[PDB]
Structures are given as structure tokens and as C-alpha cells.
Amino acid sequence: PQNENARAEALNLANTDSQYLTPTSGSPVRGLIQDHISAGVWLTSKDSF
Amino acid sequence: PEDFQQHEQIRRKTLKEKAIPKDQRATTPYMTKYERARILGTRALQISMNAPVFVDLEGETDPLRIAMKELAEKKIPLVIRRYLPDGSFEDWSVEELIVD
Amino acid sequence: MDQENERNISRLWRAFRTVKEMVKDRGYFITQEEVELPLEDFKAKYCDSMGRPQRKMMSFQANPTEESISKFPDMGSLWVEFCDEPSVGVKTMKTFVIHIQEKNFQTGIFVYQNNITPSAMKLVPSIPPATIETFNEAALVVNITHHELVPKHIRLSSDEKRELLKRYRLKESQLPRIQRADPVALYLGLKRGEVVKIIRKSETSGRYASYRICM
Amino acid sequence: YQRLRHMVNDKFQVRSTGPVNSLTMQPVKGRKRHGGIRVGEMERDALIGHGTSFLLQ
Amino acid sequence: GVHVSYDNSIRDADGTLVQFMYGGDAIDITKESHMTQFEFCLDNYYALLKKYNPSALIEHLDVESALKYSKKTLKYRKKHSKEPHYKQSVKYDPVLAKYNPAKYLGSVSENFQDKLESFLDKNSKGVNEKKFRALMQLKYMRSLINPGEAVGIIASQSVGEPSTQMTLNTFNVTLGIPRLRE
């Protein structure tokens, strides 16, 4: 976008941080996906020192 | 000069009937996230066209970040005019709106 | 001995309870003992010694409550008329037009059985201040406002019809519309322009006050 | 392992400004005509759903 | 063009009204997720308090008028809860019909009022109940839909997008998209 009115909308209204919950049912749509799920089961484990 | 004297006087009187006075205004006391996005859009677009800034821009080179500091100190001299759906309106200054 | 006459009476006993509930819902004076009239008491009063249903004593007259006069100043009397003749003729329709206008009623309800001759349906808007409303008594068997999907409709006075339009800054034509011949607008006897208030039981909020205008 | 034939060469494009159309004065279509990107009907509805009237403008 | 107006009514672009309040309660769907998570909000009272900061907030919004009218309706609605919906008396309309949710503290949908009061009495737990009312009633006031929100686009996109998920075979009555097109 090409002016400060449209920069201010894409940073405050349409940014990815305000799209965390979807408007369909209020559920979150953003989060880590495959290896990060399978690393938290290893890192937050009880053997991890 | 006969038509314009009346055509103005109709226009400024019609515009007075739609102005809602400060004691009768009924909308929200908050800045409604689109008012906040347009104030920072319109103020930054004025700052970049050499409007006088009322805040110490501490080495900031971004017009949008300057207006985000004027909004935090209640220094933006703008006015929201909130149109109710029959055309009537309420004038809320930016200094007296609560910012989310 | 009770295979059709038990149910031709019961389809007129229930159709009579609804009209007393309809007239009480329009703000007229119908007491609760008149509403809750049992079936054996309906035959002890409106069925003759042989046991047939007669539709002459069933016709009645109602008057406004004190609550309705203060809210609606022009609410007058009401005559509710049944009919023995199933195929309703223009001879009996001209009587009911004049019986309202001689006795000077405001509203007249003409409950019939099968049909009206369309030569006699022209006499429905005939009186200019008064109104004639026709009901088929097969349609009055179940009171549809008791149904769990039909919310509580309340017609408004012109005082709070005016308070509604000032608050939202509306025209009359910018409200949601209810039809002139809606089965709940025919129930409440709504004229064009009258605003009814619906209290909806919403899935997300509970009680929720909506509005709707008759055009 | 196997290498598939179809590759990603003729897939990217960038336009700052350039050619127009003579009827509409809108950016021309084209991968190799240095042509614009289409903001279609569904993206117009997506820009109203954000309430961003200036990004639509 | 269906959008939220500044009087909280849902109107079309020409001005014709569609609803008097969004969903009956004027709550944004993307803000109501921890609305009735009362035990989460009680464990995080001090952090939720300075978010929804009530110090420089009580001078701008009415505090008493909606709370008085809600207790009058809540007292009147328990006494006639045994009655059917057509024998309900209409002396008191809902408080959201009477007071602007964004200007009056405590003008709250009657479904959030029940669940909040059901929470406070079935749970005996340095936080009172009187300052947990005021926090959650302020959390209601800061979760409202904003005026100018394009709720008509969002509703159509909330049906048109998960209908793309809804396109498969039998796992009688019309199902899926051919039912939805009817």
C-alpha cells in the first residue's frame, strides 16, 4: 500500500496479530505445527536436564 | 447573490439540526479501533506534510510512529464526527475518548 | 354415541377458547374463568338438551380493561359473532355489518365455518371507522401464540411507538416489516402502521427485545 | 529419488507501475507483459470484512 | 453494507434496520472466549484488573443506573420463571434494551448475568464477590462489537468458508450444501 492511511490499516486492523481468533466460532487459528509440537514433548519432559 | 444567500442559509441551518449537543450525545466513550486506525493514518499523513508536531520525536523517522506517540500523550488535535444513520452526528474530540 | 359429535363439539370448544384468549390478548375484559371453561361445562351452557352445538349463545361482547383505555384511548367495544350457516351468505353478512354499525361497535369479529361468498367479501372494508375481521373456525383450533417458536408479541401505543422512532432515529419504513395478513398480526388485529414488540428468547443472550412494524 | 519436470521459473512477477489499457487505464494483464495483479471480487469482500476502507480505496 | 451503527443497531447501508443489537447481546465473537471462564478470570484477577483498568475509567461511564435496573429485572424474572413464555408479563424489558452497553456499567445480557450469579453463589472462595462482579461486568463492556464493524460480510464468510469443508458423501434428509442452497 501507498499512503499512511493504508499503512495504518494494515498494521492495526488487518495485521496478523488481530487475526488470532477466527470470527466463525472464536477459536484460535494460529499456532506451531509439527516438529515444534514434538519438541515440546521432549523439552518440557522430566528427563530434560 | 439572491439564491446563494438562501441556499447557504438552508444549508447551515440543516447542518445545525443534525448536530447533537455535548450533553445529549449517546454513543460510546471509547475509541472504536477504526477511529484509532484513521486518526493515526490522518495524523501521520499531516506530519509528513509539515504539520507542527507537539512531541519530542526522539530520533524517530517514521510518520506513523510519531502519531503513535502523540496519541499516547493526548496531543492529537483531531475531532471524530460520528454519523448516526439519519445523517445526524456527534462530535467527539480525540483527547476525551478512552483509548483501548 | 360419540364418534363425530364428540369431536365436532371439541373442534368448536377449542375454537371458542382461542377467541376468548385472542380477545383477552387484544386487551379486552375476558376473565380467567371464561378462558378455562371445561368441555363438560361447555355442553352444559352452549349445547342444547339434545346435545348439538348451537352457535347463537356463543356470540358475545367484550369491553376494554382499565389498563387498555389509559394506554389506548380510542379502544372501543367489540362484538364477536359466530355463524350457524357453513356457506356464509350475503344476507347474513349484511346483518353483521349493520349490527356493528347500529349498536356502534369499533371492532367486529365474524367467525365462520367453511367459506364466505366473495360477493360478501366486498363488505369487509364497508364501514369506514370500523373493521370486520373474519376467521375460519378450523384455523382457530390451536392458539398459535402458545407455540414454542412464536414469541411474545406486544403491540405498542403511539406514545412508545414515538419513543422508539426518536431513539433509533427511524422512519416508519425503516423497521423490519410484519405483513398485514400474518397469522399473529391477524391474531392481534394489527392495523397498518402499528408497531408490535417481539420479546425473543435468543440462543446467546436470553431475553431480547425486538420490534417490527405492520405494513 | 526422482526430480520432477515442472519447475518454478515462470511463476513470480513484480510490478511497481507500467503499461495500462487504453479503455480502462487499468494495469494490463501479463506474466511477461509486466502486468498487474488482480484484486478480485472475493478480495474486495475480504477488505470490507476487515473494515479497512482505505486499503479498499 | 450491513454494519454496526453507533446506536448498536444493525443496519443496512441505505439506513434500513435489520437488528436492534448484534446477536441479542452486542458481543464480538472474537472477544467472548474467556467471557464465561470465571475461574480463569478469578485466578488472574490482578492481571486482568490492570488490563481492564478501572481507575481512569469510572469518570466517563455511568456506574449505578444499569446495576439498579438489572437487580429489579433479576428479582422480577425469578418470580415468574415457572410460567410459560406466553404468560410472561412484560413490565420489565431486558436491560440492554434500556441502557447502552458501552456507556452503562452493568447493562448486560441476561444469559451472562445468570451464569455470573450462578458462579458467585456455588463457589465460596483477597478478592470479594463485589469486586469480581465489577471486573467481569467491565470485561463485558470491553468485549463489545465496535460500531462500523462489517458484521454482514463476516456472517457470510462464516457460512461460506466452512461450507467448503462441507462437501462429502453419506456417513433421508437433505444435507450439506444442497440443503443450504434450499
**Which residues on neighbouring strands pair with residue C136, listed in sequence order?**
C112
CB within 8 Å: D45 and E157 = yes
Pairing mode, strands E3-4 and E10-11: antiparallel
Return the residue in B18, B23, B28 with the most chain E beta carbons within 10 A, the one to mutate for interface testing: B28
Question: What are the residues whose beta carbons fall under 8 Å from the beta carbon of E38, sequence distance 6 or more?
Answer: E115, E116, E119, E136
Distance from CA of B48 to the nearest CA of E (A): 28
Cα-Cα end-to-end distance for chain C: 49
Query: Minimal Cα–Cα distance from B86 to chain E, Å?
Result: 7
Residues B10 and B4: their CA atoms lie apart, in Å, by 10
> What proportions of chain D, in percent to the nearest 5, are helix, strand and coil?
30, 5, 70
D28 neighbors D20 (Cβ within 8 angstroms)? yes
For residue C35, CA distances in Å to C13, C24, C30, C142, E77 come to: 11, 9, 7, 14, 25
> How many helices (DSSP H) and strands (DSSP E) are in chain E?
8, 3
Q: Minimal CA–CA distance to C177: which of E15, E17, E3?
A: E17
Going by C-beta distance under 8 Å and a sequence separation of 6 or more, which residues neighbour residue E139?
Answer: E35, E41, E48, E52
- CA proximity to A32, closest of A24, B31, A41: A41
> B34 vs D51: CB contact, 8 Å cut-off?
yes
Instruction: Please name each of the domains of chain C with its CATH number.
Output: 1-142 (3.40.1340.10), 143-215 (3.90.940.20)
Buried b (16+ CB within 10 A) or exposed e, C162-180: eebbeebbbeeebbeebee
- Cα separation, E26 vs E105, whole angstroms: 14
Q: In the 8-state DSSP scheme, what is residue D28?
A: P
Q: What is the CATH number of the domain that holds B86?
A: 3.90.940.10
Helix axes B63-70, B35-47, angle to 10 degrees: 120
Q: What is the number of structural domains in chain B?
A: 1
User: From CA E48, how far away is CA E42, in angstroms rounded?
Assistant: 9
Query: What are chain D's partners, defined as 3 or more CB pairs within 8 angstroms?
Result: A, B, E
Q: How many angstroms is the resolution? A: 2.7
**Pick from E97, E96, E80, E98: nearest CA to E137:** E96
Please report the DSSP string for C128-177 in residue order. SSSEEEEEETTTTSS-GGGSTTS-EEEEPPHHHHHHHHHHHT--GGGS-E
Query: End-to-end alpha-carbon separation of chain D, Å?
Result: 50
Domain that holds residue B21: 1-100
Q: Tell me if chain A has a CB within 8 Å of the CB of D12.
A: no
Q: CA B64, CA B36: separation in Å to the nearest integer?
A: 12
Contact E148 D45 (CB under 8 A): no
CA distance readout (Å), E140 to B29, E34, E63, E103, E149: 15, 10, 14, 12, 18
- 3+ Cβ–Cβ pairs closer than 8 Å linking E and D: yes
- CB contact at 8 A, C134 and C108: no
Give CA–CA dist E70/E139, Å, rounded.
17
Phi-psi region of C140 (alpha: psi -120 to 50; beta: other; left: phi over 0): alpha
Segments of chain A assigned E as strands: none
Q: Which residues contact E43 (CB under 8 A, 6 or more apart)?
A: none
Residues C158-165: contacts with CB within 8 Å, 24+ apart?
C159/C71, C161/C194, C161/C195, C164/C195, C164/C211
The approach used to solve this structure was cryo-EM
E35: closest CA among E122, E126, E105, E138?
Answer: E138
Q: How far is CA E14 from CA B86, C173, E3, E164, in A?
A: 10, 12, 11, 31
Measured between alpha carbons, how far is E76 from E91 in angstroms, rounded to an integer?
9
